Design a protein around this ligand. Structure first.
Ligand code: SF4
Ligand code: F3S
Length: 77
C-alpha cells in the first residue's frame, strides 16, 4: 500500500486525489491521508506527487511508519 509521509503536511494540496482508481485519498487534520489497504499498490499517484511524498509503507522510514499506522487507523477500527 502507498501511504502519505511528512512532506505533504502543510503542503496540503498539489494534488493527488482525483488520479486514484479507487479514490481512497481522504482528508485529515491538515493534509490528506490514504487508505493503504484499499489502495491496490499502484504507481499513478506516486509519479504525480511532488517528490513522491506518497511513499510505500515499507520504504517509509521507521520514523514515519507511525503515519502509515495512522493512515491505517483513520480507516481502520
Ligand atoms: S497508489 Fe494508486 S491506488 Fe493507491 S492511493 Fe495511489 S493512486 Fe490510489
Ligand atoms: S503533496 Fe500531498 S496532496 Fe497528494 S500530491 Fe502529494 S500527497
Amino acid at each position: 500500500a502507498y501511504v502519505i509521509t511528512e512532506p505533504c503536511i502543510g503542503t496540503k494540496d498539489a494534488s493527488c486525489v482525483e488520479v486514484c482508481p479507487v479514490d481512497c485519498i481522504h482528508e485529515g487534520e491538515d493534509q490528506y491521508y490514504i487508505d493503504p489497504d484499499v489502495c491496490i499498490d499502484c504507481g499513478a499517484c506516486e509519479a504525480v506527487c511532488p517528490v513522491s511524498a506518497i511513499y510505500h509503507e515499507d520504504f517509509v522510514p521507521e520514523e514515519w511508519k507511525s503515519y502509515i499506522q495512522k493512515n491505517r487507523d483513520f480507516f481502520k477500527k
